[PDB]
Amino acid sequence: ATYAQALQSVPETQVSQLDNGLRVASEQSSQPTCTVGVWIDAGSRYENEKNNGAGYFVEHLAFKGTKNRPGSALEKEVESMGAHLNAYSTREHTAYYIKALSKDLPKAVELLADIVQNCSLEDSQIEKERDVILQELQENDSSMRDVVFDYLHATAFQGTPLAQSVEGPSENVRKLSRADLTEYVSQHYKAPRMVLAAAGGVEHRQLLDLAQKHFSSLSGTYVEDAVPAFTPCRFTGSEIRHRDDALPLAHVAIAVEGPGWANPDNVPLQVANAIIGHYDSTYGGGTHMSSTLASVAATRKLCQSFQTFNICYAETGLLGAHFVCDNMSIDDMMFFLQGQWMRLCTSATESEVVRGKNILRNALVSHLDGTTPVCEDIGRSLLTYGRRIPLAEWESRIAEVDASVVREVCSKYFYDQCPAVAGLGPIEQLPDYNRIRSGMFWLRF
Amino acid sequence: CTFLRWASEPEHDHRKRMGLKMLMMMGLLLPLVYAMKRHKWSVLKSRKLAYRPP
């Protein structure tokens, strides 16, 4: 049984659709565990200036009180069968998935229905939850990686809802009352923009009638006429420099406008992003890793950790690299990393393209093990691509891309495009913005 | 008198020709080089600064 034969097996992702619009998708397998969750299209992208941070507050208060479940009784029931209930709210989507055994499926769907639908949103709990969010805001401010990405989002999509932080500015969280949250839930937690996902020992028919018997009350109405609309955002090549010399290391994240969620150029780009790769000081490869930038960094101990990201929203995304290094390396990497891009832009050979193809294949297959990654893949793919792309299709797209495709795609995305650099820490050797922009083009090509 | 002026300045015609050419050439050049300077320096001349002490 070769890779191709094993790829086809790939138990399918049968997708149904309730009359309310809730597209129920499942993935049957043999393990006695399962992951059932609801992926809603609600995030900082839809939040406005006045209520920015309502999504985080609703995520906080979702598990607290749900009317029918009086409160901590929900926690009691969840821990009774050993289920682990978790929620993650990104800039676009928000999910509440229960990680539980297969037999507890009828109760798990009911619990998710209770959370997404009948939430008490008690004012006293709002007051208690208000302090927690502020504390988490300080912890995130201490998070020296999260803040640089928030800075990149702010400086790149400036003046657009995308730049808004997921948690929200530490002024809205001190003013968000029950009325704002209830409006957010009413206007965003709608059945059409929801995917009920469950992977593992899940029968698709069982998930279907459980959703019908539980999630039927959800409606697609939008009050009188108010319908939130996706507002396209603009990528503004800029730079933000929060120089704080007291910090030990320096974080710098540089990105350009990339593709959207549904765009074929995503597949080659990751391959290119695989060629540059990622490195951390505790790797062991050292001076032998095939990635040229990683080998150069390890030879001189240039950085402490550089990674390449492919943040990709609906209409536009962020393509680039975030690197953490001491004060007197920011220049060098800014010369090297850009140069690597330039090389990938200028002259790419089939050898490293094949290497990147293998790395991307391995990342896709290894990322999809366990119930929760499969459930998350289903929930995100149904909302983003409109369907779960099977791994066979991914194999086809990866087989299609070659050196010419990578070169042309990088040229269309990387060559002579204004970046969106964003720094933090003792950023002083970081080259001026015109130096970075000048590095975006090569006077030989 | 005109003959003597030519005699001590046997480049007058060509000197004024060069004057014309240089005048028009740099009437083009100054605006464009200045535009390049402002284009490159525009990052500095639009730096919104901030100060957020704890």
Side-chain angles (χ1 to χ4, degrees):
Chain A
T2 73
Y3 180 52
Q5 279 91 57
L7 255 223
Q8 305 137 202
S9 161
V10 166
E12 278 299 347
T13 224
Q14 317 84 314
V15 179
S16 313
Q17 193 250 28
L18 258 161
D19 35 30
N20 315 137
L22 175 59
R23 310 112 71 169
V24 163
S26 88
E27 161 129 347
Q28 196 140 21
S29 150
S30 276
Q31 42 266 48
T33 83
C34 61
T35 305
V36 62
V38 181
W39 272 255
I40 315 113
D41 269 353
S44 164
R45 139 82 63 71
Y46 312 98
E47 292 186 312
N48 51 271
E49 241 285 9
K50 140 211 164 191
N51 57 20
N52 188 209
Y56 201 28
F57 226 79
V58 171
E59 190 200 53
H60 271 248
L61 292 140
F63 306 150
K64 270 39 197 322
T66 77
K67 284 186 289 303
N68 324 297
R69 242 65 62 168
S72 192
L74 169 59
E75 233 171 271
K76 190 154 316 163
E77 309 184 354
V78 171
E79 297 155 321
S80 314
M81 72 275 288
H84 322 299
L85 157 70
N86 181 264
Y88 87 93
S89 164
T90 166
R91 216 163 300 236
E92 265 181 324
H93 322 79
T94 291
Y96 311 82
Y97 44 78
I98 288 192
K99 179 169 203 336
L101 300 185
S102 295
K103 44 177 320 293
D104 312 289
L105 196 50
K107 167 68 111 186
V109 182
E110 148 185 24
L111 257 30
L112 286 176
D114 207 351
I115 338 189
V116 123
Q117 272 213 350
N118 309 21
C119 173
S120 332
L121 256 198
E122 208 75 346
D123 305 59
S124 92
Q125 248 302 329
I126 290 188
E127 304 322 291
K128 292 170 47 152
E129 270 281 16
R130 185 167 316 259
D131 332 324
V132 180
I133 273 100
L134 288 141
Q135 301 327 282
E136 296 218 13
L137 270 283
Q138 291 125 40
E139 315 192 357
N140 300 342
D141 295 313
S142 174
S143 165
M144 171 155 148
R145 166 234 184 74
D146 279 29
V147 302
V148 78
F149 275 72
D150 260 324
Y151 282 5
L152 208 164
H153 286 100
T155 188
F157 304 136
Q158 44 176 261
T160 88
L162 262 179
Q164 283 179 14
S165 69
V166 184
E167 307 100 315
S170 74
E171 187 40 50
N172 272 4
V173 313
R174 263 186 333 270
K175 310 184 324 301
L176 280 158
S177 71
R178 195 199 230 268
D180 331 338
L181 309 183
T182 314
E183 273 64 1
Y184 178 95
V185 178
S186 82
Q187 286 251 328
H188 286 149
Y189 280 31
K190 278 303 173 32
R193 31 209 302 144
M194 276 161 160
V195 166
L196 175 56
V202 197
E203 162 57 70
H204 186 55
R205 282 308 324 296
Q206 277 355 274
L207 202 59
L208 206 37
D209 47 329
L210 260 286
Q212 170 42 29
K213 175 208 171 282
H214 274 319
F215 278 83
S216 50
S217 60
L218 267 196
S219 165
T221 182
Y222 261 123
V223 187
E224 185 227 0
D225 77 289
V227 279
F230 147 83
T231 82
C233 298
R234 93 163 169 291
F235 179 89
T236 311
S238 51
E239 158 195 308
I240 173 184
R241 275 193 219 204
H242 176 203
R243 169 221 269 278
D244 188 4
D245 289 316
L247 306 190
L249 266 42
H251 278 220
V252 191
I254 169 164
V256 307
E257 157 142 29
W261 261 129
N263 176 29
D265 317 314
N266 214 35
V267 170
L269 267 191
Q270 293 147 22
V271 179
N273 255 4
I275 300 189
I276 314 149
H278 65 332
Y279 162 80
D280 187 325
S281 68
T282 81
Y283 259 25
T287 36
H288 283 146
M289 292 211 319
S290 153
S291 154
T292 295
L293 187 277
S295 67
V296 166
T299 319
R300 326 226 293 251
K301 291 80 49 153
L302 258 201
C303 78
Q304 189 257 32
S305 58
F306 90 99
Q307 282 92 332
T308 66
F309 46 69
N310 225 309
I311 322 280
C312 209
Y313 302 112
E315 85 279 56
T316 173
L318 296 181
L319 150 68
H322 152 267
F323 65 94
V324 184
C325 63
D326 62 17
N327 61 4
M328 294 214 195
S329 319
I330 323 177
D331 163 342
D332 281 299
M333 309 208 74
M334 255 311 161
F335 155 67
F336 283 108
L337 162 66
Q338 283 201 84
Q340 270 318 285
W341 282 351
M342 291 325 317
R343 143 171 189 276
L344 260 185
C345 199
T346 279
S347 97
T349 78
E350 271 70 353
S351 93
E352 69 269 353
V353 179
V354 164
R355 188 172 59 82
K357 288 149 104 213
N358 311 323
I359 298 268
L360 173 69
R361 298 185 181 106
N362 287 287
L364 302 178
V365 287
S366 72
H367 159 36
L368 259 202
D369 55 358
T371 55
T372 58
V374 178
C375 207
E376 204 280 328
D377 191 13
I378 298 164
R380 178 215 298 308
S381 284
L382 249 61
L383 283 175
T384 51
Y385 319 119
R387 76 204 153 84
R388 166 111 172 289
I389 273 64
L391 299 83
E393 170 168 342
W394 284 124
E395 204 28 71
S396 84
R397 331 209 74 111
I398 300 160
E400 219 80 11
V401 54
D402 70 85
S404 88
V405 189
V406 156
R407 252 188 323 281
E408 71 93 354
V409 155
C410 265
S411 299
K412 176 201 89 74
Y413 276 121
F414 274 130
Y415 201 74
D416 213 35
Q417 302 307 308
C418 311
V421 317
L424 173 75
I427 50 196
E428 161 171 341
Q429 211 188 47
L430 171 62
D432 181 276
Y433 184 87
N434 284 291
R435 292 307 278 276
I436 308 163
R437 178 53 179 82
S438 274
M440 278 293 119
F441 60 87
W442 257 19
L443 287 94
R444 320 152 223 174
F445 198 127
Chain B
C1 210
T2 52
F3 179 53
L4 300 196
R5 148 70 29 180
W6 167 84
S8 318
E9 190 81 18
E11 69 266 61
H12 196 108
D13 293 302
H14 208 56
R15 192 165 43 90
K16 313 247 151 167
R17 164 177 267 101
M18 252 164 266
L20 200 149
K21 310 238 193 133
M22 152 275 262
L23 277 188
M24 321 196 318
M25 181 35 78
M26 296 201 358
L28 288 41
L29 270 194
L30 272 306
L32 304 161
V33 177
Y34 185 48
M36 260 168 76
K37 184 256 167 215
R38 306 269 301 201
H39 174 31
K40 209 57 70 45
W41 257 87
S42 34
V43 181
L44 271 304
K45 286 177 192 233
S46 64
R47 292 188 349 278
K48 253 52 161 183
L49 258 65
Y51 185 41
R52 327 207 87 227

mmCIF file with all atom_site columns, all heavy atoms in Angstrom, chain A residues 76-88, unseen atoms left out:
data_model
loop_
_atom_site.group_PDB
_atom_site.id
_atom_site.type_symbol
_atom_site.label_atom_id
_atom_site.label_alt_id
_atom_site.label_comp_id
_atom_site.label_asym_id
_atom_site.label_entity_id
_atom_site.label_seq_id
_atom_site.pdbx_PDB_ins_code
_atom_site.Cartn_x
_atom_site.Cartn_y
_atom_site.Cartn_z
_atom_site.occupancy
_atom_site.B_iso_or_equiv
_atom_site.pdbx_formal_charge
_atom_site.auth_seq_id
_atom_site.auth_comp_id
_atom_site.auth_asym_id
_atom_site.auth_atom_id
_atom_site.pdbx_PDB_model_num
ATOM 1  N N   . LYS A 1 76 ? -19.916 20.492 35.624 1.00 0.00 ? 76 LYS A N   1
ATOM 2  C CA  . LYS A 1 76 ? -20.100 19.200 36.276 1.00 0.00 ? 76 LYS A CA  1
ATOM 3  C C   . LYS A 1 76 ? -20.447 18.120 35.260 1.00 0.00 ? 76 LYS A C   1
ATOM 4  O O   . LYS A 1 76 ? -19.863 17.031 35.270 1.00 0.00 ? 76 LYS A O   1
ATOM 5  C CB  . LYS A 1 76 ? -21.191 19.305 37.341 1.00 0.00 ? 76 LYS A CB  1
ATOM 6  C CG  . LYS A 1 76 ? -21.298 18.092 38.248 1.00 0.00 ? 76 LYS A CG  1
ATOM 7  C CD  . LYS A 1 76 ? -21.893 18.460 39.599 1.00 0.00 ? 76 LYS A CD  1
ATOM 8  C CE  . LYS A 1 76 ? -21.287 19.745 40.145 1.00 0.00 ? 76 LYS A CE  1
ATOM 9  N NZ  . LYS A 1 76 ? -22.120 20.338 41.228 1.00 0.00 ? 76 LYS A NZ  1
ATOM 10 N N   . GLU A 1 77 ? -21.395 18.411 34.365 1.00 0.00 ? 77 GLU A N   1
ATOM 11 C CA  . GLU A 1 77 ? -21.765 17.432 33.347 1.00 0.00 ? 77 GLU A CA  1
ATOM 12 C C   . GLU A 1 77 ? -20.611 17.156 32.392 1.00 0.00 ? 77 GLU A C   1
ATOM 13 O O   . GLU A 1 77 ? -20.375 16.002 32.020 1.00 0.00 ? 77 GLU A O   1
ATOM 14 C CB  . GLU A 1 77 ? -22.997 17.896 32.571 1.00 0.00 ? 77 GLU A CB  1
ATOM 15 C CG  . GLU A 1 77 ? -24.167 18.306 33.438 1.00 0.00 ? 77 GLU A CG  1
ATOM 16 C CD  . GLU A 1 77 ? -25.393 18.658 32.623 1.00 0.00 ? 77 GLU A CD  1
ATOM 17 O OE1 . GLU A 1 77 ? -25.291 18.690 31.379 1.00 0.00 ? 77 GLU A OE1 1
ATOM 18 O OE2 . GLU A 1 77 ? -26.461 18.900 33.225 1.00 0.00 ? 77 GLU A OE2 1
ATOM 19 N N   . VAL A 1 78 ? -19.880 18.197 31.985 1.00 0.00 ? 78 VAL A N   1
ATOM 20 C CA  . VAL A 1 78 ? -18.775 17.999 31.050 1.00 0.00 ? 78 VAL A CA  1
ATOM 21 C C   . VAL A 1 78 ? -17.694 17.125 31.673 1.00 0.00 ? 78 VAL A C   1
ATOM 22 O O   . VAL A 1 78 ? -17.149 16.228 31.019 1.00 0.00 ? 78 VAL A O   1
ATOM 23 C CB  . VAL A 1 78 ? -18.213 19.357 30.586 1.00 0.00 ? 78 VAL A CB  1
ATOM 24 C CG1 . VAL A 1 78 ? -16.933 19.155 29.798 1.00 0.00 ? 78 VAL A CG1 1
ATOM 25 C CG2 . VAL A 1 78 ? -19.234 20.080 29.731 1.00 0.00 ? 78 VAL A CG2 1
ATOM 26 N N   . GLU A 1 79 ? -17.374 17.361 32.945 1.00 0.00 ? 79 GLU A N   1
ATOM 27 C CA  . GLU A 1 79 ? -16.350 16.564 33.607 1.00 0.00 ? 79 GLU A CA  1
ATOM 28 C C   . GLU A 1 79 ? -16.868 15.217 34.089 1.00 0.00 ? 79 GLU A C   1
ATOM 29 O O   . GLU A 1 79 ? -16.064 14.375 34.503 1.00 0.00 ? 79 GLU A O   1
ATOM 30 C CB  . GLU A 1 79 ? -15.759 17.342 34.784 1.00 0.00 ? 79 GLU A CB  1
ATOM 31 C CG  . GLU A 1 79 ? -15.052 18.624 34.380 1.00 0.00 ? 79 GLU A CG  1
ATOM 32 C CD  . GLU A 1 79 ? -15.010 19.648 35.495 1.00 0.00 ? 79 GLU A CD  1
ATOM 33 O OE1 . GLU A 1 79 ? -16.011 19.770 36.231 1.00 0.00 ? 79 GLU A OE1 1
ATOM 34 O OE2 . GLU A 1 79 ? -13.975 20.332 35.637 1.00 0.00 ? 79 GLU A OE2 1
ATOM 35 N N   . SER A 1 80 ? -18.185 14.995 34.055 1.00 0.00 ? 80 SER A N   1
ATOM 36 C CA  . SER A 1 80 ? -18.726 13.715 34.504 1.00 0.00 ? 80 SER A CA  1
ATOM 37 C C   . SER A 1 80 ? -18.258 12.566 33.619 1.00 0.00 ? 80 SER A C   1
ATOM 38 O O   . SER A 1 80 ? -17.880 11.502 34.121 1.00 0.00 ? 80 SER A O   1
ATOM 39 C CB  . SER A 1 80 ? -20.252 13.775 34.545 1.00 0.00 ? 80 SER A CB  1
ATOM 40 O OG  . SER A 1 80 ? -20.698 14.963 35.172 1.00 0.00 ? 80 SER A OG  1
ATOM 41 N N   . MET A 1 81 ? -18.280 12.755 32.301 1.00 0.00 ? 81 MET A N   1
ATOM 42 C CA  . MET A 1 81 ? -17.848 11.711 31.381 1.00 0.00 ? 81 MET A CA  1
ATOM 43 C C   . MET A 1 81 ? -16.416 11.898 30.902 1.00 0.00 ? 81 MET A C   1
ATOM 44 O O   . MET A 1 81 ? -15.984 11.182 29.993 1.00 0.00 ? 81 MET A O   1
ATOM 45 C CB  . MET A 1 81 ? -18.784 11.636 30.169 1.00 0.00 ? 81 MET A CB  1
ATOM 46 C CG  . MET A 1 81 ? -18.656 12.794 29.192 1.00 0.00 ? 81 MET A CG  1
ATOM 47 S SD  . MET A 1 81 ? -19.642 14.228 29.644 1.00 0.00 ? 81 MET A SD  1
ATOM 48 C CE  . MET A 1 81 ? -21.287 13.627 29.277 1.00 0.00 ? 81 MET A CE  1
ATOM 49 N N   . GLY A 1 82 ? -15.672 12.835 31.484 1.00 0.00 ? 82 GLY A N   1
ATOM 50 C CA  . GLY A 1 82 ? -14.302 13.069 31.083 1.00 0.00 ? 82 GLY A CA  1
ATOM 51 C C   . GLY A 1 82 ? -14.129 13.926 29.853 1.00 0.00 ? 82 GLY A C   1
ATOM 52 O O   . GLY A 1 82 ? -13.010 14.024 29.339 1.00 0.00 ? 82 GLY A O   1
ATOM 53 N N   . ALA A 1 83 ? -15.196 14.548 29.361 1.00 0.00 ? 83 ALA A N   1
ATOM 54 C CA  . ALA A 1 83 ? -15.093 15.406 28.192 1.00 0.00 ? 83 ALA A CA  1
ATOM 55 C C   . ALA A 1 83 ? -14.283 16.658 28.506 1.00 0.00 ? 83 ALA A C   1
ATOM 56 O O   . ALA A 1 83 ? -14.364 17.220 29.601 1.00 0.00 ? 83 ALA A O   1
ATOM 57 C CB  . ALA A 1 83 ? -16.484 15.797 27.695 1.00 0.00 ? 83 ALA A CB  1
ATOM 58 N N   . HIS A 1 84 ? -13.488 17.090 27.530 1.00 0.00 ? 84 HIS A N   1
ATOM 59 C CA  . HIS A 1 84 ? -12.746 18.344 27.612 1.00 0.00 ? 84 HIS A CA  1
ATOM 60 C C   . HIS A 1 84 ? -13.373 19.325 26.632 1.00 0.00 ? 84 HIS A C   1
ATOM 61 O O   . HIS A 1 84 ? -13.309 19.121 25.415 1.00 0.00 ? 84 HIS A O   1
ATOM 62 C CB  . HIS A 1 84 ? -11.262 18.137 27.308 1.00 0.00 ? 84 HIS A CB  1
ATOM 63 C CG  . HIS A 1 84 ? -10.703 16.865 27.860 1.00 0.00 ? 84 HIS A CG  1
ATOM 64 N ND1 . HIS A 1 84 ? -10.687 16.583 29.209 1.00 0.00 ? 84 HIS A ND1 1
ATOM 65 C CD2 . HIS A 1 84 ? -10.131 15.801 27.248 1.00 0.00 ? 84 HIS A CD2 1
ATOM 66 C CE1 . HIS A 1 84 ? -10.134 15.400 29.404 1.00 0.00 ? 84 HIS A CE1 1
ATOM 67 N NE2 . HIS A 1 84 ? -9.788  14.904 28.230 1.00 0.00 ? 84 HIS A NE2 1
ATOM 68 N N   . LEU A 1 85 ? -13.976 20.384 27.160 1.00 0.00 ? 85 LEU A N   1
ATOM 69 C CA  . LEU A 1 85 ? -14.626 21.400 26.347 1.00 0.00 ? 85 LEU A CA  1
ATOM 70 C C   . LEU A 1 85 ? -13.699 22.600 26.215 1.00 0.00 ? 85 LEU A C   1
ATOM 71 O O   . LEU A 1 85 ? -13.158 23.086 27.214 1.00 0.00 ? 85 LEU A O   1
ATOM 72 C CB  . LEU A 1 85 ? -15.963 21.811 26.967 1.00 0.00 ? 85 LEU A CB  1
ATOM 73 C CG  . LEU A 1 85 ? -16.541 23.176 26.603 1.00 0.00 ? 85 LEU A CG  1
ATOM 74 C CD1 . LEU A 1 85 ? -16.994 23.187 25.156 1.00 0.00 ? 85 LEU A CD1 1
ATOM 75 C CD2 . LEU A 1 85 ? -17.698 23.509 27.527 1.00 0.00 ? 85 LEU A CD2 1
ATOM 76 N N   . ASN A 1 86 ? -13.513 23.069 24.984 1.00 0.00 ? 86 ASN A N   1
ATOM 77 C CA  . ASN A 1 86 ? -12.555 24.128 24.707 1.00 0.00 ? 86 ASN A CA  1
ATOM 78 C C   . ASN A 1 86 ? -13.132 25.056 23.650 1.00 0.00 ? 86 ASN A C   1
ATOM 79 O O   . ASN A 1 86 ? -13.978 24.654 22.845 1.00 0.00 ? 86 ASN A O   1
ATOM 80 C CB  . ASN A 1 86 ? -11.213 23.547 24.243 1.00 0.00 ? 86 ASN A CB  1
ATOM 81 C CG  . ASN A 1 86 ? -10.180 24.614 23.954 1.00 0.00 ? 86 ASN A CG  1
ATOM 82 O OD1 . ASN A 1 86 ? -10.004 25.030 22.809 1.00 0.00 ? 86 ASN A OD1 1
ATOM 83 N ND2 . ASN A 1 86 ? -9.481  25.057 24.991 1.00 0.00 ? 86 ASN A ND2 1
ATOM 84 N N   . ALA A 1 87 ? -12.670 26.304 23.660 1.00 0.00 ? 87 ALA A N   1
ATOM 85 C CA  . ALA A 1 87 ? -13.096 27.298 22.688 1.00 0.00 ? 87 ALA A CA  1
ATOM 86 C C   . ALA A 1 87 ? -11.896 28.102 22.220 1.00 0.00 ? 87 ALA A C   1
ATOM 87 O O   . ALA A 1 87 ? -11.042 28.484 23.024 1.00 0.00 ? 87 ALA A O   1
ATOM 88 C CB  . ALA A 1 87 ? -14.152 28.240 23.272 1.00 0.00 ? 87 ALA A CB  1
ATOM 89 N N   . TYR A 1 88 ? -11.836 28.358 20.915 1.00 0.00 ? 88 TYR A N   1
ATOM 90 C CA  . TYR A 1 88 ? -10.794 29.196 20.334 1.00 0.00 ? 88 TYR A CA  1
ATOM 91 C C   . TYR A 1 88 ? -11.452 30.189 19.391 1.00 0.00 ? 88 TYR A C   1
ATOM 92 C CB  . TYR A 1 88 ? -9.743  28.355 19.599 1.00 0.00 ? 88 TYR A CB  1
ATOM 93 C CG  . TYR A 1 88 ? -10.071 28.050 18.153 1.00 0.00 ? 88 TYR A CG  1
ATOM 94 C CD1 . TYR A 1 88 ? -9.609  28.865 17.127 1.00 0.00 ? 88 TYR A CD1 1
ATOM 95 C CD2 . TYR A 1 88 ? -10.826 26.937 17.814 1.00 0.00 ? 88 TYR A CD2 1
ATOM 96 C CE1 . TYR A 1 88 ? -9.904  28.587 15.807 1.00 0.00 ? 88 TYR A CE1 1
ATOM 97 C CE2 . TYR A 1 88 ? -11.123 26.651 16.495 1.00 0.00 ? 88 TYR A CE2 1
ATOM 98 C CZ  . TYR A 1 88 ? -10.661 27.479 15.497 1.00 0.00 ? 88 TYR A CZ  1
ATOM 99 O OH  . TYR A 1 88 ? -10.956 27.197 14.183 1.00 0.00 ? 88 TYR A OH  1
#
